[PDB]
Design an enzyme around this catalytic site. Structure first.
Site, PDB file in Angstrom:
ATOM      1  N   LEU A   1      -5.268  10.362  -6.824  1.00 52.22           N
ATOM      2  CA  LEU A   1      -5.941  11.534  -6.284  1.00 52.22           C
ATOM      3  C   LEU A   1      -6.577  11.333  -4.879  1.00 52.22           C
TER       4      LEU A   1
ATOM      5  N   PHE B   1       0.302   4.260  -0.284  1.00 53.79           N
ATOM      6  CA  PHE B   1      -0.202   5.337   0.562  1.00 53.79           C
ATOM      7  C   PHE B   1      -0.400   4.889   2.006  1.00 53.79           C
ATOM      8  N   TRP B   2      -1.220   3.857   2.225  1.00 56.28           N
ATOM      9  CA  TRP B   2      -1.574   3.481   3.621  1.00 56.28           C
ATOM     10  C   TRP B   2      -0.392   3.081   4.502  1.00 56.28           C
TER      11      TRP B   2
ATOM     12  N   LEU C   1     -23.610   7.010   7.872  1.00 55.48           N
ATOM     13  CA  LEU C   1     -24.643   7.314   6.858  1.00 55.48           C
ATOM     14  C   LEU C   1     -24.214   6.921   5.462  1.00 55.48           C
TER      15      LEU C   1
ATOM     16  N   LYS D   1      -5.226   7.652 -10.564  1.00 50.54           N
ATOM     17  CA  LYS D   1      -4.248   8.697 -10.781  1.00 50.54           C
ATOM     18  C   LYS D   1      -3.787   9.241  -9.421  1.00 50.54           C
TER      19      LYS D   1
ATOM     20  N   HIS E   1       0.864  -1.173   0.000  1.00 46.26           N
ATOM     21  CA  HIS E   1       0.000   0.000   0.000  1.00 46.26           C
ATOM     22  C   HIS E   1       0.908   1.232   0.000  1.00 46.26           C
TER      23      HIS E   1
ATOM     24  N   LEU F   1     -16.103  10.046   0.271  1.00 47.60           N
ATOM     25  CA  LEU F   1     -14.904  10.130  -0.571  1.00 47.60           C
ATOM     26  C   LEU F   1     -15.283   9.652  -1.965  1.00 47.60           C
ATOM     27  N   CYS F   2     -14.999  10.485  -2.964  1.00 41.53           N
ATOM     28  CA  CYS F   2     -15.385  10.191  -4.310  1.00 41.53           C
ATOM     29  C   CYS F   2     -14.457  10.897  -5.287  1.00 41.53           C
TER      30      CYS F   2
HETATM   31  C1  LIG Z   1      -7.227  13.386  11.727  1.00 41.10           C
HETATM   32  C2  LIG Z   1      -8.318  13.298  10.651  1.00 41.10           C
HETATM   33  C3  LIG Z   1      -7.903  12.397   9.481  1.00 41.10           C
HETATM   34  C4  LIG Z   1      -8.937  12.288   8.347  1.00 41.10           C
HETATM   35  C5  LIG Z   1      -8.575  11.185   7.321  1.00 41.10           C
HETATM   36  C6  LIG Z   1      -8.967   9.768   7.798  1.00 41.10           C
HETATM   37  C7  LIG Z   1      -8.638   8.674   6.759  1.00 41.10           C
HETATM   38  C8  LIG Z   1      -9.824   8.543   5.795  1.00 41.10           C
HETATM   39  C9  LIG Z   1      -9.662   7.513   4.675  1.00 41.10           C
HETATM   40  C10 LIG Z   1     -10.828   7.600   3.662  1.00 41.10           C
HETATM   41  C11 LIG Z   1     -12.136   6.970   4.192  1.00 41.10           C
HETATM   42  C12 LIG Z   1     -13.287   7.103   3.200  1.00 41.10           C
HETATM   43  C13 LIG Z   1     -14.536   6.326   3.654  1.00 41.10           C
HETATM   44  C14 LIG Z   1     -15.472   6.262   2.467  1.00 41.10           C
HETATM   45  O1  LIG Z   1     -15.967   7.291   1.992  1.00 41.10           O
HETATM   46  S1  LIG Z   1     -15.788   4.768   1.754  1.00 41.10           S
HETATM   47  C15 LIG Z   1     -16.524   5.105   0.166  1.00 41.10           C
HETATM   48  C16 LIG Z   1     -15.420   5.404  -0.835  1.00 41.10           C
HETATM   49  N1  LIG Z   1     -16.021   5.828  -2.099  1.00 41.10           N
HETATM   50  C17 LIG Z   1     -16.290   5.071  -3.164  1.00 41.10           C
HETATM   51  O2  LIG Z   1     -16.071   3.875  -3.164  1.00 41.10           O
HETATM   52  C18 LIG Z   1     -16.908   5.721  -4.385  1.00 41.10           C
HETATM   53  C19 LIG Z   1     -16.459   5.077  -5.717  1.00 41.10           C
HETATM   54  N2  LIG Z   1     -14.980   5.069  -5.803  1.00 41.10           N
HETATM   55  C20 LIG Z   1     -14.165   6.120  -5.897  1.00 41.10           C
HETATM   56  O3  LIG Z   1     -14.619   7.258  -5.928  1.00 41.10           O
HETATM   57  C21 LIG Z   1     -12.670   5.909  -5.993  1.00 41.10           C
HETATM   58  O4  LIG Z   1     -12.375   4.552  -6.358  1.00 41.10           O
HETATM   59  C22 LIG Z   1     -11.943   6.172  -4.664  1.00 41.10           C
HETATM   60  C23 LIG Z   1     -12.036   7.662  -4.326  1.00 41.10           C
HETATM   61  C24 LIG Z   1     -12.544   5.318  -3.533  1.00 41.10           C
HETATM   62  C25 LIG Z   1     -10.476   5.792  -4.781  1.00 41.10           C
HETATM   63  O5  LIG Z   1      -9.785   6.506  -5.816  1.00 41.10           O
HETATM   64  P1  LIG Z   1      -9.068   5.747  -7.040  1.00 41.10           P
HETATM   65  O6  LIG Z   1      -9.743   4.414  -7.197  1.00 41.10           O
HETATM   66  O7  LIG Z   1      -9.043   6.779  -8.136  1.00 41.10           O
HETATM   67  O8  LIG Z   1      -7.633   5.406  -6.418  1.00 41.10           O
HETATM   68  P2  LIG Z   1      -6.414   6.451  -6.272  1.00 41.10           P
HETATM   69  O9  LIG Z   1      -5.424   6.019  -7.339  1.00 41.10           O
HETATM   70  O10 LIG Z   1      -6.947   7.861  -6.265  1.00 41.10           O
HETATM   71  O11 LIG Z   1      -5.854   6.034  -4.828  1.00 41.10           O
HETATM   72  C26 LIG Z   1      -5.471   4.691  -4.513  1.00 41.10           C
HETATM   73  C27 LIG Z   1      -5.353   4.583  -2.994  1.00 41.10           C
HETATM   74  O12 LIG Z   1      -6.629   4.803  -2.373  1.00 41.10           O
HETATM   75  C28 LIG Z   1      -6.905   3.767  -1.440  1.00 41.10           C
HETATM   76  N3  LIG Z   1      -8.374   3.589  -1.336  1.00 41.10           N
HETATM   77  C29 LIG Z   1      -9.214   3.052  -2.235  1.00 41.10           C
HETATM   78  N4  LIG Z   1     -10.475   3.072  -1.743  1.00 41.10           N
HETATM   79  C30 LIG Z   1     -10.423   3.638  -0.516  1.00 41.10           C
HETATM   80  C31 LIG Z   1     -11.376   3.937   0.438  1.00 41.10           C
HETATM   81  N5  LIG Z   1     -12.707   3.640   0.252  1.00 41.10           N
HETATM   82  N6  LIG Z   1     -10.973   4.545   1.562  1.00 41.10           N
HETATM   83  C32 LIG Z   1      -9.683   4.843   1.821  1.00 41.10           C
HETATM   84  N7  LIG Z   1      -8.751   4.580   0.885  1.00 41.10           N
HETATM   85  C33 LIG Z   1      -9.096   3.963  -0.270  1.00 41.10           C
HETATM   86  C34 LIG Z   1      -6.235   2.569  -2.076  1.00 41.10           C
HETATM   87  O13 LIG Z   1      -6.047   1.505  -1.154  1.00 41.10           O
HETATM   88  C35 LIG Z   1      -4.929   3.191  -2.556  1.00 41.10           C
HETATM   89  O14 LIG Z   1      -4.014   3.348  -1.473  1.00 41.10           O
HETATM   90  P3  LIG Z   1      -2.742   2.359  -1.381  1.00 41.10           P
HETATM   91  O15 LIG Z   1      -3.208   0.863  -1.039  1.00 41.10           O
HETATM   92  O16 LIG Z   1      -1.912   2.379  -2.735  1.00 41.10           O
HETATM   93  O17 LIG Z   1      -1.969   2.598  -0.012  1.00 41.10           O
HETATM   94  C1  LIG Z   2     -28.799  -1.350  -3.420  1.00 49.48           C
HETATM   95  C2  LIG Z   2     -27.303  -1.026  -3.491  1.00 49.48           C
HETATM   96  N1  LIG Z   2     -26.793   0.116  -3.971  1.00 49.48           N
HETATM   97  N2  LIG Z   2     -25.550   0.028  -3.908  1.00 49.48           N
HETATM   98  C3  LIG Z   2     -24.650   1.103  -4.341  1.00 49.48           C
HETATM   99  C4  LIG Z   2     -25.127  -1.142  -3.419  1.00 49.48           C
HETATM  100  C5  LIG Z   2     -23.651  -1.528  -3.203  1.00 49.48           C
HETATM  101  C6  LIG Z   2     -26.268  -1.880  -3.130  1.00 49.48           C
HETATM  102  N3  LIG Z   2     -26.395  -3.113  -2.621  1.00 49.48           N
HETATM  103  S1  LIG Z   2     -26.493  -3.375  -0.975  1.00 49.48           S
HETATM  104  O1  LIG Z   2     -26.614  -4.857  -0.798  1.00 49.48           O
HETATM  105  O2  LIG Z   2     -27.684  -2.644  -0.465  1.00 49.48           O
HETATM  106  C7  LIG Z   2     -24.990  -2.841  -0.249  1.00 49.48           C
HETATM  107  C8  LIG Z   2     -23.892  -3.691  -0.387  1.00 49.48           C
HETATM  108  C9  LIG Z   2     -22.671  -3.283   0.107  1.00 49.48           C
HETATM  109  C10 LIG Z   2     -22.548  -2.042   0.727  1.00 49.48           C
HETATM  110  N4  LIG Z   2     -21.312  -1.715   1.167  1.00 49.48           N
HETATM  111  C11 LIG Z   2     -20.935  -0.545   1.997  1.00 49.48           C
HETATM  112  C12 LIG Z   2     -20.468   0.712   1.244  1.00 49.48           C
HETATM  113  N5  LIG Z   2     -20.211   1.755   2.277  1.00 49.48           N
HETATM  114  C13 LIG Z   2     -21.503   2.130   2.893  1.00 49.48           C
HETATM  115  C14 LIG Z   2     -21.354   3.138   4.049  1.00 49.48           C
HETATM  116  N6  LIG Z   2     -20.450   4.257   3.682  1.00 49.48           N
HETATM  117  C15 LIG Z   2     -20.241   5.090   4.885  1.00 49.48           C
HETATM  118  C16 LIG Z   2     -19.192   3.821   3.040  1.00 49.48           C
HETATM  119  C17 LIG Z   2     -19.548   2.987   1.801  1.00 49.48           C
HETATM  120  N7  LIG Z   2     -23.639  -1.242   0.842  1.00 49.48           N
HETATM  121  C18 LIG Z   2     -24.833  -1.589   0.357  1.00 49.48           C
END
Ligand SMILES: CCCCCCCCCCCCCC(=O)SCCNC(=O)CCNC(=O)[C@H](O)C(C)(C)COP(=O)(O)OP(=O)(O)OC[C@H]1O[C@@H](n2cnc3c(N)ncnc32)[C@H](O)[C@@H]1OP(=O)(O)O
Ligand SMILES: Cc1nn(C)c(C)c1NS(=O)(=O)c1ccc(NCCN2CCN(C)CC2)nc1
Length: 411
Positions: free
Chosen positions: A170, A4-5, A411, A168, A2, A159-160
Site C-alpha cells: 500500500l 518499487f524504488w 518535523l 500489502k 526494491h 507516511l503511515c
Molecule cells: C514530485 C513529488 C513526489 C512525492 C513523493 C516523494 C517520495 C516519498 C517517499 C516516502 C517518504 C516518507 C518519509 C516518511 O514519512 S518516513 C516515516 C515513515 N513512516 C513510518 O515509519 C510509520 C510506521 N510504518 C508504516 O506506517 C509502514 O511500515 C510504512 C508506511 C512506512 C510502509 O508500509 P508497509 O511496511 O506496509 O510496506 P508496503 O508493503 O506498503 O510497501 C513496501 C515498500 O515501501 C518502502 N518503504 C518502507 N518504508 C518507507 C519509507 N519510510 N519511505 C519510503 N518508502 C518506504 C519499502 O522499501 C518497499 O519498497 P521496495 O523496497 O519493495 O522498493
Molecule cells: C522517544 C522516541 N520515540 N520514538 C518513536 C522514537 C523512535 C524515539 N527514540 S529517539 O531516540 O528519540 C529517535 C530515534 C530515531 C528516530 N528516527 C527518525 C524517524 N524519522 C523522524 C523524522 N521524520 C520526518 C521521519 C521519521 N527518531 C527519534
C-alpha cells in the site's frame, strides 16, 4: 531488490550517488498535461480521501491513525504521539495545497487506513560549494550553476499505513498518488527524510540526545546507566548530578518571540542558512508560521539586548507514547529547530534552550548533526543515539554531502 524504488527517478546505489557531480533532474521534462487526471487505481473496498486540515475532526482522525500506527523504535518501546495542534501547524503552512494531503479510507465506514502528506517548501538545492569549485577549475561552471535558483518543491512527511494493512504494498500506492497530485501542480522534485535506509540518501546524520530528566529516561529504558557509574556508591545520584541544569536562563535579554520580531529573525536566519549547501528560503509569512510560539507545539526565544534582536533559538515538542512501561504515559521530547547566533557563542545560546526545555518539563532534547549542531554536543552533554536521519530527494541528482552542509529541519 526494491520492486518499487527500482521503478523511481532516484539514484539506485551508493556508487551511483558518489559518482554524481552536479545538481539536476533525473527524469525527462514532463508536462502537467502528461499526468493522469484520475486518481491512481486502488482496490474497490477503499477510496481516496483529501482531509480538511482546518477542520478539527479530520485533524482528529489523522491524529488517531498516527497515534496508533506511526513511527516506533525497533524494540516497540515508544511510538510518536504528535498532537492535533502540532499536525495543524505542520500540515497547514502558508500557501499549502490541500490536495497534497493524501489519505486512504475504507469505503464502507470511512475508517482511516493510511496517510501521506506533502507541503510546499522553497529550497536551495543547487550544486554544492566544493563541486562548484571543481567545476570552475574545469570550465563547467555554467553546468554547475544551472539550478542555483531556489526551487518551489514538495516536502513529504507522515507516511503511515495502518498496522493491519502492513506489507500489502500500500505504501507504493500512496507515494504514486502523492507524486501524481504534486506533478499536477507542476512540481517535479520532493525532499523527504527517513530513519530507514532507502535508495539513496544524499546526506546522513546521527541523532543526539540531551537528558533533562535522567531518572525517568532510565526508568523507561530510553537511556541506560553507563558502566563507569557502577563504580559510584549511588549511580543515579551521580547521573542526576551530571545532567542537572540551572532553572533560569543565563542570557539577559532572553524572551519569547513576538510578531514584531519576524523581520529581524528572518534576516539573521536567512544570512546563516544561506551559508549551507541545502537549505530553505523563508518568507515573512513562513518565519511567522514556523517560529512564532504556539502552546504545546513550538517554543521560540530571541536575545534582545538593547531593543535589538541579535540571536534566537527554537524547539518543537513531540511526545511519544511509552508503550511498555505502565508508570508513564508520555515521553516528552524537545527537538532543536532553527536558530541563529550573532552576539554570543552557539553553545551559550543553546544552553538556554536546554534550561527552558528543562523548566517546562521536557524529558530529553533531541537533534540531528545538521546545521552547526556538532559545535555544542560535547560541552552541553549531548550523546549520540543508535538512530540516523537520512535525507533524500525525489527526481533530483545530488552529490553526497556531509550532514553539516544541510540546513533543512524536518518535523
Ligand atoms: C514530485 C513529488 C513526489 C512525492 C513523493 C516523494 C517520495 C516519498 C517517499 C516516502 C517518504 C516518507 C518519509 C516518511 O514519512 S518516513 C516515516 C515513515 N513512516 C513510518 O515509519 C510509520 C510506521 N510504518 C508504516 O506506517 C509502514 O511500515 C510504512 C508506511 C512506512 C510502509 O508500509 P508497509 O511496511 O506496509 O510496506 P508496503 O508493503 O506498503 O510497501 C513496501 C515498500 O515501501 C518502502 N518503504 C518502507 N518504508 C518507507 C519509507 N519510510 N519511505 C519510503 N518508502 C518506504 C519499502 O522499501 C518497499 O519498497 P521496495 O523496497 O519493495 O522498493
Ligand atoms: C522517544 C522516541 N520515540 N520514538 C518513536 C522514537 C523512535 C524515539 N527514540 S529517539 O531516540 O528519540 C529517535 C530515534 C530515531 C528516530 N528516527 C527518525 C524517524 N524519522 C523522524 C523524522 N521524520 C520526518 C521521519 C521519521 N527518531 C527519534
Amino acid at each position: 531488490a526494491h520492486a518499487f524504488w527500482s521503478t523511481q527517478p532516484v539514484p539506485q546505489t551508493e556508487d551511483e550517488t558518489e559518482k554524481i557531480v552536479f545538481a539536476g533532474p533525473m527524469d525527462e521534462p514532463k508536462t502537467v498535461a502528461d499526468i493522469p487526471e484520475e486518481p491512481y487505481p486502488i482496490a474497490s473496498t477503499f477510496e481516496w480521501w483529501t482531509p480538511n486540515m482546518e477542520a478539527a475532526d479530520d485533524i482528529h482522525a489523522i491524529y488517531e491513525l498516527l497515534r496508533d500506527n506511526y513511527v516506533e523504535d525497533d524494540d516497540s518501546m515508544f511510538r510518536f504521539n504528535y498532537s492535533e495542534e502540532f499536525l495543524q501547524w505542520a500540515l497547514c503552512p502558508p500557501n499549502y495545497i490541500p490536495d497534497w494531503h493524501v489519505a486512504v479510507r475504507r469505503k464502507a465506514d470511512k475508517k482511516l487506513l493510511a496517510f501521506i502528506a506533502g507541503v510546499p517548501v522553497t529550497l536551495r538545492m543547487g550544486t554544492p560549494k566544493y563541486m562548484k569549485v571543481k567545476a570552475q577549475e574545469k570550465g563547467e561552471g555554467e553546468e554547475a550553476a544551472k539550478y542555483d535558483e531556489p526551487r518551489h518543491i514538495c516536502e513529504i512527511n507522515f507516511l503511515c499505513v495502518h498496522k493491519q494493512l502492513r506489507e500489502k504494498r500500500l505504501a507504493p500506492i500512496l507515494i504514486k498518488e502523492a507524486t501524481r497530485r504534486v506533478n499536477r501542480t507542476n512540481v517535479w522534485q520532493a525532499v523527504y527524510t527517513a530513519g530507514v535506509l532507502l535508495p539513496t540518501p544524499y546526506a546522513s546524520g546521527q541523532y543526539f540526545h540531551r537528558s533533562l530528566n535522567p531518572e525517568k529516561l532510565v526508568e523507561i529504558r530510553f537511556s541506560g546507566i553507563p558502566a563507569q557509574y557502577q563504580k559510584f556508591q549511588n549511580p543515579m545520584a551521580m547521573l542526576k548530578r551530571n545532567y542537572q541544569l540551572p532553572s533560569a536562563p543565563k542570557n539577559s535579554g532572553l524572551r519569547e518571540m513576538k510578531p514584531s520580531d519576524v523581520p529581524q529573525v528572518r534576516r539573521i536566519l536567512m544570512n546563516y542558512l544561506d551559508s549551507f549547501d541545502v537549505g530553505p528560503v523563508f518568507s515573512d509569512a513562513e518565519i511567522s508560521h514556523y517560529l512564532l510560539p504556539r502552546d504545546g507545539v513550538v517554543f521560540t526565544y530571541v536575545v534582545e539586548n538593547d531593543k535589538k534582536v541579535t540571536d534566537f533559538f527554537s524547539f518543537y515538542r513531540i511526545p511519544s507514547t511509552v508503550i511498555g512501561n505502565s508508570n508513564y504515559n508520555l515521553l516528552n521530547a524537545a527537538y532543536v529547530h532553527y536558530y541563529a547566533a550573532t552576539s554570543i557563542p552557539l553553545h551559550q545560546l543553546i544552553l538556554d534552550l536546554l534550561i527552558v526545555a528543562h523548566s517546562r518539563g521536557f524529558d530529553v532534547c533531541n537533534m540531528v548533526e545538521i546545521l552547526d549542531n556538532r559545535s555544542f554536543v560535547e560541552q552541553l552533554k549531548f550523546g549520540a543515539g543508535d538512530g540516523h536521519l537520512r535525507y533524500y530527494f525525489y527526481n533530483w541528482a545530488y552529490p553526497k554531502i556531509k550532514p553539516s552542509q544541510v540546513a533543512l529541519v524536518m518535523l
